[PDB]
Amino acid sequence: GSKMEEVD
Amino acid sequence: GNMEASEVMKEKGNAAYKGKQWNKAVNFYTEAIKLNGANATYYCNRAAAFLELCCFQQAEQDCTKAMLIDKKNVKAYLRRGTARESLVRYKEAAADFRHALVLEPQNKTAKVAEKRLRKHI
């Protein structure tokens, strides 16, 4: 799941 | 080379972001992008730093560039969606939160957002 609060 | 430096700058941005150094993050990501302008994640990450600063237009433009580079970037839709909902543009937000779910059916953030947006659209 793409967690929007985390940068990649 | 600059390609390698770009990833280093991205990683420094990610550390700045994780420590809540939002401007530092923006500045690392700006440099990342100046060195390598063809990476959707560099733009998407910078959007995230802009969201935290309430720089919603700049976040949007960045999510919009991230999608030009890579249409399938889930976080670009989630983040542009958030900036739009913040700018009370609920119809446009829903489109983006809906498209994120097209790309990532299980995405919890888009589903929470759709439910909240329902009572404004």
mmCIF file of all heavy atoms in Angstrom, chain B residues 70-101:
data_model
loop_
_atom_site.group_PDB
_atom_site.id
_atom_site.type_symbol
_atom_site.label_atom_id
_atom_site.label_comp_id
_atom_site.label_asym_id
_atom_site.label_seq_id
_atom_site.Cartn_x
_atom_site.Cartn_y
_atom_site.Cartn_z
ATOM 1 N N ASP B 70 5.343 9.632 -15.368
ATOM 2 C CA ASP B 70 4.816 8.301 -15.121
ATOM 3 C C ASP B 70 3.371 8.354 -14.655
ATOM 4 O O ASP B 70 3.054 8.604 -13.470
ATOM 5 C CB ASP B 70 5.690 7.597 -14.099
ATOM 6 C CG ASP B 70 5.181 6.212 -13.701
ATOM 7 O OD1 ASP B 70 4.448 5.542 -14.466
ATOM 8 O OD2 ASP B 70 5.551 5.797 -12.592
ATOM 9 N N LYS B 71 2.515 8.062 -15.614
ATOM 10 C CA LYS B 71 1.072 7.975 -15.399
ATOM 11 C C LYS B 71 0.640 7.089 -14.280
ATOM 12 O O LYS B 71 -0.428 7.307 -13.742
ATOM 13 C CB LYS B 71 0.374 7.475 -16.683
ATOM 14 C CG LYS B 71 -0.117 8.606 -17.575
ATOM 15 C CD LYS B 71 -1.078 8.138 -18.661
ATOM 16 C CE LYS B 71 -2.061 9.244 -19.028
ATOM 17 N NZ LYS B 71 -2.974 8.831 -20.126
ATOM 18 N N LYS B 72 1.418 6.048 -13.967
ATOM 19 C CA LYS B 72 1.010 5.065 -12.978
ATOM 20 C C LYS B 72 1.491 5.394 -11.544
ATOM 21 O O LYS B 72 1.329 4.595 -10.673
ATOM 22 C CB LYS B 72 1.450 3.680 -13.431
ATOM 23 C CG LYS B 72 0.737 3.246 -14.709
ATOM 24 C CD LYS B 72 1.297 1.946 -15.246
ATOM 25 C CE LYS B 72 0.402 1.376 -16.334
ATOM 26 N NZ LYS B 72 1.064 0.261 -17.070
ATOM 27 N N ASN B 73 2.079 6.571 -11.313
ATOM 28 C CA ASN B 73 2.492 6.970 -9.985
ATOM 29 C C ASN B 73 1.325 7.235 -9.025
ATOM 30 O O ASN B 73 0.724 8.305 -9.057
ATOM 31 C CB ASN B 73 3.367 8.229 -10.019
ATOM 32 C CG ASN B 73 3.998 8.488 -8.683
ATOM 33 O OD1 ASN B 73 3.285 8.732 -7.697
ATOM 34 N ND2 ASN B 73 5.309 8.278 -8.593
ATOM 35 N N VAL B 74 1.075 6.298 -8.122
ATOM 36 C CA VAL B 74 -0.111 6.337 -7.289
ATOM 37 C C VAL B 74 -0.132 7.570 -6.401
ATOM 38 O O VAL B 74 -1.160 8.232 -6.255
ATOM 39 C CB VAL B 74 -0.229 5.106 -6.371
ATOM 40 C CG1 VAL B 74 -1.458 5.234 -5.454
ATOM 41 C CG2 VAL B 74 -0.314 3.837 -7.196
ATOM 42 N N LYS B 75 0.987 7.823 -5.761
ATOM 43 C CA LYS B 75 1.125 8.939 -4.846
ATOM 44 C C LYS B 75 0.923 10.317 -5.477
ATOM 45 O O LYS B 75 0.441 11.211 -4.811
ATOM 46 C CB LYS B 75 2.440 8.835 -4.056
ATOM 47 C CG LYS B 75 2.423 7.681 -3.053
ATOM 48 C CD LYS B 75 3.521 7.782 -2.000
ATOM 49 C CE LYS B 75 3.794 6.450 -1.301
ATOM 50 N NZ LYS B 75 4.880 6.514 -0.255
ATOM 51 N N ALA B 76 1.199 10.460 -6.769
ATOM 52 C CA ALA B 76 0.914 11.697 -7.488
ATOM 53 C C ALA B 76 -0.579 12.056 -7.504
ATOM 54 O O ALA B 76 -0.957 13.229 -7.355
ATOM 55 C CB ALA B 76 1.518 11.632 -8.904
ATOM 56 N N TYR B 77 -1.434 11.036 -7.661
ATOM 57 C CA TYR B 77 -2.861 11.200 -7.612
ATOM 58 C C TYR B 77 -3.383 11.504 -6.184
ATOM 59 O O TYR B 77 -4.198 12.434 -5.981
ATOM 60 C CB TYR B 77 -3.579 10.002 -8.273
ATOM 61 C CG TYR B 77 -3.201 9.871 -9.703
ATOM 62 C CD1 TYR B 77 -2.282 8.951 -10.093
ATOM 63 C CD2 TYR B 77 -3.718 10.745 -10.687
ATOM 64 C CE1 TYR B 77 -1.854 8.874 -11.407
ATOM 65 C CE2 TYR B 77 -3.296 10.670 -12.013
ATOM 66 C CZ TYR B 77 -2.365 9.722 -12.365
ATOM 67 O OH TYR B 77 -1.911 9.586 -13.656
ATOM 68 N N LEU B 78 -2.923 10.711 -5.210
ATOM 69 C CA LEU B 78 -3.255 10.921 -3.786
ATOM 70 C C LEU B 78 -2.918 12.322 -3.317
ATOM 71 O O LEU B 78 -3.740 12.991 -2.713
ATOM 72 C CB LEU B 78 -2.495 9.935 -2.928
ATOM 73 C CG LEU B 78 -2.862 8.447 -3.139
ATOM 74 C CD1 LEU B 78 -2.110 7.578 -2.145
ATOM 75 C CD2 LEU B 78 -4.335 8.213 -2.951
ATOM 76 N N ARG B 79 -1.690 12.754 -3.618
ATOM 77 C CA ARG B 79 -1.193 14.101 -3.272
ATOM 78 C C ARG B 79 -1.844 15.270 -4.040
ATOM 79 O O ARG B 79 -2.184 16.295 -3.408
ATOM 80 C CB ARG B 79 0.334 14.173 -3.379
ATOM 81 C CG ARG B 79 1.032 13.357 -2.267
ATOM 82 C CD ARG B 79 2.555 13.293 -2.381
ATOM 83 N NE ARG B 79 3.029 12.445 -1.306
ATOM 84 C CZ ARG B 79 4.001 11.559 -1.379
ATOM 85 N NH1 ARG B 79 4.722 11.394 -2.484
ATOM 86 N NH2 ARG B 79 4.259 10.841 -0.314
ATOM 87 N N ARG B 80 -2.035 15.139 -5.362
ATOM 88 C CA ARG B 80 -2.752 16.181 -6.094
ATOM 89 C C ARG B 80 -4.194 16.269 -5.584
ATOM 90 O O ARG B 80 -4.734 17.374 -5.392
ATOM 91 C CB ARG B 80 -2.733 15.961 -7.601
ATOM 92 C CG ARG B 80 -3.007 17.257 -8.348
ATOM 93 C CD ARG B 80 -2.806 17.192 -9.838
ATOM 94 N NE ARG B 80 -3.775 16.312 -10.486
ATOM 95 C CZ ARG B 80 -3.778 16.044 -11.788
ATOM 96 N NH1 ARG B 80 -2.896 16.623 -12.608
ATOM 97 N NH2 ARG B 80 -4.684 15.229 -12.285
ATOM 98 N N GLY B 81 -4.784 15.099 -5.338
ATOM 99 C CA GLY B 81 -6.083 14.988 -4.683
ATOM 100 C C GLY B 81 -6.199 15.745 -3.382
ATOM 101 O O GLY B 81 -7.181 16.469 -3.164
ATOM 102 N N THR B 82 -5.198 15.577 -2.525
ATOM 103 C CA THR B 82 -5.163 16.250 -1.225
ATOM 104 C C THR B 82 -5.071 17.761 -1.383
ATOM 105 O O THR B 82 -5.708 18.473 -0.628
ATOM 106 C CB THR B 82 -4.010 15.730 -0.350
ATOM 107 O OG1 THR B 82 -4.106 14.308 -0.273
ATOM 108 C CG2 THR B 82 -4.044 16.315 1.060
ATOM 109 N N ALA B 83 -4.280 18.238 -2.349
ATOM 110 C CA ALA B 83 -4.044 19.677 -2.517
ATOM 111 C C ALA B 83 -5.325 20.299 -3.042
ATOM 112 O O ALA B 83 -5.710 21.403 -2.646
ATOM 113 C CB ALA B 83 -2.872 19.966 -3.473
ATOM 114 N N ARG B 84 -5.978 19.588 -3.956
ATOM 115 C CA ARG B 84 -7.249 20.016 -4.458
ATOM 116 C C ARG B 84 -8.323 20.071 -3.373
ATOM 117 O O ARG B 84 -9.013 21.067 -3.267
ATOM 118 C CB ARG B 84 -7.683 19.131 -5.603
ATOM 119 C CG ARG B 84 -6.933 19.480 -6.853
ATOM 120 C CD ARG B 84 -7.136 18.387 -7.871
ATOM 121 N NE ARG B 84 -6.546 18.779 -9.134
ATOM 122 C CZ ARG B 84 -6.663 18.073 -10.258
ATOM 123 N NH1 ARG B 84 -7.335 16.902 -10.294
ATOM 124 N NH2 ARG B 84 -6.098 18.543 -11.355
ATOM 125 N N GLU B 85 -8.449 19.030 -2.567
ATOM 126 C CA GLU B 85 -9.440 19.046 -1.486
ATOM 127 C C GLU B 85 -9.172 20.200 -0.494
ATOM 128 O O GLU B 85 -10.118 20.792 0.050
ATOM 129 C CB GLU B 85 -9.453 17.723 -0.772
ATOM 130 C CG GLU B 85 -10.434 17.675 0.361
ATOM 131 C CD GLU B 85 -10.481 16.329 1.013
ATOM 132 O OE1 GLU B 85 -9.610 15.472 0.717
ATOM 133 O OE2 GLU B 85 -11.403 16.116 1.835
ATOM 134 N N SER B 86 -7.887 20.500 -0.283
ATOM 135 C CA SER B 86 -7.452 21.639 0.528
ATOM 136 C C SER B 86 -7.844 22.956 -0.113
ATOM 137 O O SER B 86 -8.200 23.897 0.599
ATOM 138 C CB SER B 86 -5.945 21.625 0.737
ATOM 139 O OG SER B 86 -5.570 20.567 1.591
ATOM 140 N N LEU B 87 -7.755 23.032 -1.444
ATOM 141 C CA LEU B 87 -8.203 24.214 -2.174
ATOM 142 C C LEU B 87 -9.699 24.176 -2.511
ATOM 143 O O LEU B 87 -10.137 24.859 -3.433
ATOM 144 C CB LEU B 87 -7.364 24.400 -3.443
ATOM 145 C CG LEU B 87 -5.906 24.776 -3.216
ATOM 146 C CD1 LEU B 87 -5.187 24.759 -4.552
ATOM 147 C CD2 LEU B 87 -5.772 26.136 -2.532
ATOM 148 N N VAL B 88 -10.461 23.362 -1.766
ATOM 149 C CA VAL B 88 -11.920 23.223 -1.871
ATOM 150 C C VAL B 88 -12.392 22.903 -3.320
ATOM 151 O O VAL B 88 -13.517 23.215 -3.695
ATOM 152 C CB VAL B 88 -12.620 24.443 -1.154
ATOM 153 C CG1 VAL B 88 -14.151 24.444 -1.264
ATOM 154 C CG2 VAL B 88 -12.239 24.464 0.330
ATOM 155 N N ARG B 89 -11.540 22.248 -4.121
ATOM 156 C CA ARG B 89 -11.909 21.836 -5.475
ATOM 157 C C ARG B 89 -12.248 20.351 -5.444
ATOM 158 O O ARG B 89 -11.465 19.492 -5.904
ATOM 159 C CB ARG B 89 -10.816 22.212 -6.474
ATOM 160 C CG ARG B 89 -10.981 23.655 -6.929
ATOM 161 C CD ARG B 89 -9.690 24.365 -7.255
ATOM 162 N NE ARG B 89 -8.987 23.734 -8.373
ATOM 163 C CZ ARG B 89 -7.835 23.050 -8.302
ATOM 164 N NH1 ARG B 89 -7.176 22.869 -7.141
ATOM 165 N NH2 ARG B 89 -7.325 22.541 -9.428
ATOM 166 N N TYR B 90 -13.415 20.071 -4.861
ATOM 167 C CA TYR B 90 -13.800 18.721 -4.468
ATOM 168 C C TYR B 90 -14.029 17.778 -5.658
ATOM 169 O O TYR B 90 -13.754 16.595 -5.545
ATOM 170 C CB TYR B 90 -15.052 18.707 -3.596
ATOM 171 C CG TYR B 90 -14.983 19.518 -2.316
ATOM 172 C CD1 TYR B 90 -15.920 20.539 -2.053
ATOM 173 C CD2 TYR B 90 -14.007 19.269 -1.368
ATOM 174 C CE1 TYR B 90 -15.865 21.269 -0.888
ATOM 175 C CE2 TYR B 90 -13.943 20.012 -0.205
ATOM 176 C CZ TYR B 90 -14.872 20.998 0.029
ATOM 177 O OH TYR B 90 -14.785 21.717 1.177
ATOM 178 N N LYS B 91 -14.527 18.305 -6.771
ATOM 179 C CA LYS B 91 -14.824 17.501 -7.972
ATOM 180 C C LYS B 91 -13.507 16.986 -8.532
ATOM 181 O O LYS B 91 -13.357 15.791 -8.783
ATOM 182 C CB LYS B 91 -15.623 18.325 -9.033
ATOM 183 C CG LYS B 91 -15.310 18.095 -10.530
ATOM 184 C CD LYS B 91 -16.300 17.167 -11.238
ATOM 185 C CE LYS B 91 -15.725 16.501 -12.493
ATOM 186 N NZ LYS B 91 -14.961 15.240 -12.233
ATOM 187 N N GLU B 92 -12.556 17.903 -8.699
ATOM 188 C CA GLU B 92 -11.208 17.556 -9.163
ATOM 189 C C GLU B 92 -10.430 16.620 -8.208
ATOM 190 O O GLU B 92 -9.709 15.725 -8.651
ATOM 191 C CB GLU B 92 -10.425 18.836 -9.429
ATOM 192 C CG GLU B 92 -10.955 19.612 -10.612
ATOM 193 C CD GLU B 92 -10.477 21.046 -10.600
ATOM 194 O OE1 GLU B 92 -9.266 21.254 -10.794
ATOM 195 O OE2 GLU B 92 -11.314 21.953 -10.391
ATOM 196 N N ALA B 93 -10.599 16.820 -6.904
ATOM 197 C CA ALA B 93 -10.012 15.900 -5.927
ATOM 198 C C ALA B 93 -10.561 14.490 -6.165
ATOM 199 O O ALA B 93 -9.781 13.550 -6.301
ATOM 200 C CB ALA B 93 -10.278 16.335 -4.484
ATOM 201 N N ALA B 94 -11.886 14.357 -6.233
ATOM 202 C CA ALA B 94 -12.499 13.031 -6.377
ATOM 203 C C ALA B 94 -11.979 12.333 -7.617
ATOM 204 O O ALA B 94 -11.708 11.162 -7.590
ATOM 205 C CB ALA B 94 -14.019 13.108 -6.402
ATOM 206 N N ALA B 95 -11.824 13.053 -8.711
ATOM 207 C CA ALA B 95 -11.275 12.439 -9.894
ATOM 208 C C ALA B 95 -9.909 11.789 -9.612
ATOM 209 O O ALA B 95 -9.633 10.640 -10.054
ATOM 210 C CB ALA B 95 -11.180 13.456 -10.997
ATOM 211 N N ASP B 96 -9.059 12.515 -8.873
ATOM 212 C CA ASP B 96 -7.733 12.028 -8.571
ATOM 213 C C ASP B 96 -7.803 10.893 -7.554
ATOM 214 O O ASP B 96 -7.119 9.880 -7.726
ATOM 215 C CB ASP B 96 -6.839 13.121 -8.002
ATOM 216 C CG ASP B 96 -6.378 14.116 -9.011
ATOM 217 O OD1 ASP B 96 -6.339 13.864 -10.243
ATOM 218 O OD2 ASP B 96 -5.990 15.192 -8.508
ATOM 219 N N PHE B 97 -8.636 11.027 -6.517
ATOM 220 C CA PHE B 97 -8.724 9.944 -5.557
ATOM 221 C C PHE B 97 -9.333 8.690 -6.272
ATOM 222 O O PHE B 97 -9.001 7.561 -5.933
ATOM 223 C CB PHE B 97 -9.486 10.349 -4.273
ATOM 224 C CG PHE B 97 -8.680 11.225 -3.306
ATOM 225 C CD1 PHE B 97 -9.123 12.522 -2.970
ATOM 226 C CD2 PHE B 97 -7.524 10.748 -2.683
ATOM 227 C CE1 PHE B 97 -8.401 13.335 -2.089
ATOM 228 C CE2 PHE B 97 -6.801 11.564 -1.805
ATOM 229 C CZ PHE B 97 -7.238 12.861 -1.512
ATOM 230 N N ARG B 98 -10.193 8.896 -7.277
ATOM 231 C CA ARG B 98 -10.806 7.762 -8.002
ATOM 232 C C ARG B 98 -9.795 7.082 -8.869
ATOM 233 O O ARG B 98 -9.735 5.853 -8.916
ATOM 234 C CB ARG B 98 -12.041 8.186 -8.761
ATOM 235 C CG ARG B 98 -13.283 8.230 -7.847
ATOM 236 C CD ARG B 98 -14.420 8.956 -8.514
ATOM 237 N NE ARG B 98 -15.620 9.010 -7.684
ATOM 238 C CZ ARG B 98 -16.626 9.870 -7.853
ATOM 239 N NH1 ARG B 98 -16.617 10.768 -8.832
ATOM 240 N NH2 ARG B 98 -17.688 9.812 -7.049
ATOM 241 N N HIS B 99 -8.940 7.881 -9.521
ATOM 242 C CA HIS B 99 -7.913 7.313 -10.351
ATOM 243 C C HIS B 99 -6.816 6.548 -9.599
ATOM 244 O O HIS B 99 -6.286 5.549 -10.123
ATOM 245 C CB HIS B 99 -7.259 8.348 -11.258
ATOM 246 C CG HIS B 99 -6.586 7.721 -12.425
ATOM 247 N ND1 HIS B 99 -7.296 7.083 -13.424
ATOM 248 C CD2 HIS B 99 -5.280 7.571 -12.734
ATOM 249 C CE1 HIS B 99 -6.456 6.605 -14.324
ATOM 250 N NE2 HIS B 99 -5.227 6.889 -13.929
ATOM 251 N N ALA B 100 -6.470 7.009 -8.402
ATOM 252 C CA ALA B 100 -5.534 6.284 -7.567
ATOM 253 C C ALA B 100 -6.040 4.882 -7.290
ATOM 254 O O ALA B 100 -5.230 3.950 -7.170
ATOM 255 C CB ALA B 100 -5.331 6.998 -6.248
ATOM 256 N N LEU B 101 -7.366 4.751 -7.114
ATOM 257 C CA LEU B 101 -8.010 3.447 -6.843
ATOM 258 C C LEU B 101 -8.089 2.561 -8.075
ATOM 259 O O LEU B 101 -8.134 1.328 -7.961
ATOM 260 C CB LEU B 101 -9.386 3.624 -6.203
ATOM 261 C CG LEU B 101 -9.378 4.117 -4.758
ATOM 262 C CD1 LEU B 101 -10.728 4.654 -4.340
ATOM 263 C CD2 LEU B 101 -8.914 3.074 -3.746
#
